[PDB]
Write a protein that binds this ligand. Sequence first.
Ligand SMILES: Nc1nc2c(ncn2[C@@H]2O[C@H](COP(=O)(O)OP(=O)(O)CP(=O)(O)O)[C@@H](O)[C@H]2O)c(=O)[nH]1
Lengths: 267, 470
Amino acid sequence: TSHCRFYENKYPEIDDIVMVNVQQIAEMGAYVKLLEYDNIEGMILLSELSRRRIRSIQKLIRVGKNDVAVVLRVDKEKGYIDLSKRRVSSEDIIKCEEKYQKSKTVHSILRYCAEKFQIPLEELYKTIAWPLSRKFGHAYEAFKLSIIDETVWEGIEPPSKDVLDELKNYISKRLTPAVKIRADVEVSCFSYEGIDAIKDALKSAEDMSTEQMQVKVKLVAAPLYVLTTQALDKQKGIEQLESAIEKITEVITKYGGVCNITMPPKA
Amino acid sequence: GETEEEKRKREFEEGGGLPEQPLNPDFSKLNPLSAEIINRQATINIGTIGHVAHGKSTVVRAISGVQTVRFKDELERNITIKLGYANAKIYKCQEPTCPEPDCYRSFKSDKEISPKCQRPGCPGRYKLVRHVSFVDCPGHDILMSTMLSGAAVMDAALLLIAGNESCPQPQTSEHLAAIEIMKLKHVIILQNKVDLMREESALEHQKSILKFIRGTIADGAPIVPISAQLKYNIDAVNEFIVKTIPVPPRDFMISPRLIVIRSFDVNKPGAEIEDLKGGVAGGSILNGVFKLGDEIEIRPGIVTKDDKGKIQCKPIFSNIVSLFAEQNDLKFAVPGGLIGVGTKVDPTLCRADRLVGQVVGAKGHLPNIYTDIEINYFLLRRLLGVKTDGQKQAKVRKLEPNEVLMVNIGSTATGARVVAVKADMARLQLTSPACTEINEKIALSRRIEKHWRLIGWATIKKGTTLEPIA
RNA sequence: AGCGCCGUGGCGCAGUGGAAGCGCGCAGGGCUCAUAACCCUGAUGUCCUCGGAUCGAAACCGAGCGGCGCUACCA
Ligand SMILES: Nc1nc2c(ncn2[C@@H]2O[C@H](COP(=O)(O)OP(=O)(O)CP(=O)(O)O)[C@@H](O)[C@H]2O)c(=O)[nH]1
C-alpha cells in the first residue's frame, strides 16, 4: 500500500513545486491528487491551468498522466489544496523532474521492501527513511553511501534486522551504477626506442590498478592514447588517471621524445 | 569430393610451398636468380604510369591478383596519395609443347614454388622465372612529388594510353620524360582501352603513339594491347617484362643505404598494447644487403626549430626487429626490393605521410644533411603534362632567386629557395633537411598555373652540411 | 579495426525503473451552407537477437545484429 508521504509531514507548504497525476476534470476545474506528497486532493482551476489560451483541456491535461505544478494556498484542518500550473518557470520543471525521480526511486525501493515483508509502509518509513532524510536531507544519497560506505546504518533502528538485511540486498541488487571516465593523451615521440616505452608505461599502469576498479590504457591512435576507467567511487579514478599521466611523463622525459595533452581526465 | 581449401593446400604442398630463407647464406656466391633469393624477395621493381581516370590498380590486379586499397573513403575512385602495391610472380611452363605466348602466367604473393599448369591439356608445372614488384604511381597534376618518388623506386615502367580519349596524352608524356630523367630506358607501352575500338581505330591509335615517340630518348619501348576488364593478354605483359627488362647491376660491394618512402605502424586498436609491435617504415633497397637484427638510423630525424630558428636534426637510431619482403618476415635482404623495415620506434613516427621520401642508413655510415646546396641543372623546350588547346605548348621560364621551387631529390620532397642562378648551375637553401650520399639524381618543379610542374633534371655537386647531434 | 550513438506505431525525438509515448502522419466523426483552420476517437509493433536480478524490464547489467561520427587501411 503506497501511502505515508515522502516528506516529514503529510501536508504541503506555501510556495513549493510539486508534480501531480490528474484523476478527473470538472467544469470549474480539476480536484486532483498530489504525488510529491501522499494522497491529499486539491483544485487546479482552468484559468490557472494552461499557459496559452485554454482552447482544449483534453490535449493539455491528459488525465492519468504526470504534470508539474505549484501550490498557492493550503487547508491545514482536514486537507485541501489550491494549486497552480501556468506559473511553472522553464527552470522549475527541471528541478521538479529530478526531485520526483529521486523520490520515485526511494519510494519504489521501500514499496518493494513493504511488499516482501507485508508490513505497512508507514512503520517502515518511520523506522528507516525519516532518520536518513533528517541526517542527509534525502535518503538516496544515504543509499549511495551504503553502496560505498556502510557506516550509514549505525544508530538507526529497523523494525527487525531481517528488514535491514533484505533492504541492503535490494540496494546491492537494484542501485548498481560506475562512471566511464575517459581521457586522451597526445603521443609525440619520435625517439629511438618507443614501443618498450609504452610497454613499461602500461606495465606500471596495471601495477597500481586496484582490485575494485580496473585500469586499462586503450590504443585508438598512435598519438591519441585513450584512458578509460570505471569510477565506482567517482572521486579516486581522477587520481588514478593523474598518477598514470605522471608515470607516462616520467617515461617520456628521458627517452628523447615528448608528449602532449588534449583531453585531461574528465567524466 | 574435397573442398577448395583442401585441394589448394594439397597443391601448395605438392608445389613446394613457401621455403624459409636460411639464416646465413654464403653471400658472395648468390645471384638474384638463386633459389634462396627468387623464392621470397622481389628482384625487379616495375611501376604503372598513366593519365587520370585510366586505371592502374585494375591492370595491376589483372596481372597479379593483389588489390590496392586506395583508402580515405574519398580517394577511393578519383586519385590516390600513397603507394598502391601488389605482388606478382611470373611463371613459365617447363614443357616445350606449351604455347610460348600463353605459357607465361602471373600469380599472387601467396603462391607456391611450382603451381600446376592451368592450361587445359598439358601436365607440366610452372617455374618462377623472376620475382617482381608492381607500384602504382598517382597520375594527377596535383600529385607530382609522389610520381617522382615512384620513379626513384621504379626500375621499370609501364605506360598506359587509352584509345577513345585524345591519342597524344600529356600526362603520359610527362611521366615518360620524368622516368627518362631517372635514367630508365626500359619502358613498355600498353593500350588501356581496346574493346570499344574498331579494327581501324586501334591501328590509328598505334600510329598516333608511334608518331608520339620519335624524337624522345625512348627507343625500343614495345606496344602491348591489354584490357583491364576481361583479364586477358596479361601473359603478354609478363612476357614483355621478362624479355625486355634486365636486372640492373646491384651486388654486395656497394654500401648499404635505403630509401624509405611510405609509413605504416603496427598498432592493433582495441587489443591490449602488451601484445603489440614497433613502428614500420616502407622503403626500397637501391644498394646494400640487410639482415634481421641490425641497427638503422633515419638521418633527417626529428627536425626541431630553436629559439633562433636553426634546424636541429636529431637522427633516429633504432634496432630492426623484423624485415618483411612481400610475403613473410625474412632474414636477409637482397638489393633492389621493397621492404617494410620494422623497429622499436614510437608509432607516431609511422602513422601518417611523414617518412615520405627520406633516406636511412646502417651503422658504420654517416650520411650528411644539407642546408645550402649547389646543383647543376638543365631544362627542356616544351612543358609536359599541360593541355594548351592548340596554342604553342608553354616553354619553361628561367629560374628566379628567392622563389619557392620544389626540388625533389630522387624522392625527397624539399622546398628550396634560390639564392643565385647562372647559365647552368644554381644554389638553393632547404628548409626541410635533405641528405646527400653519392649522386641522388634530382627533379625540379615550379608553380605558375596554381600547380606543380616538372621543368628539368638536376644533380648535386657541393653543399654546406650539418653534422648530426648526439 | 577502436569506441560514441541509434534501433518507432509510418517519419522525427524521448521516457527508463509498474507495460503501451508524443508531434507529424492516415481513417472516421464534429463545428461551417461549404473548404481549409480548429476540436474529438482510433488501428497499425517483436522501442535490434539471446540471458541474469527481481511480484516486475523495454528500462539496469551481460554475451552478439545492421547502419551511422571521429581514429584510421594501422606489415
Ligand atoms: N572499360 C574499361 N574500364 C577501365 C579500364 N581500365 C580501368 N577501367 C576503369 O577505370 C576506373 C578507375 O578506377 P581505378 O583504377 O580504381 O582508379 P585509379 O587508376 O587507381 C586512379 P590513378 O589512375 O590516378 O592512379 C575503374 O572503374 C576501372 O574499372 C579499361 O581498360 N576498360
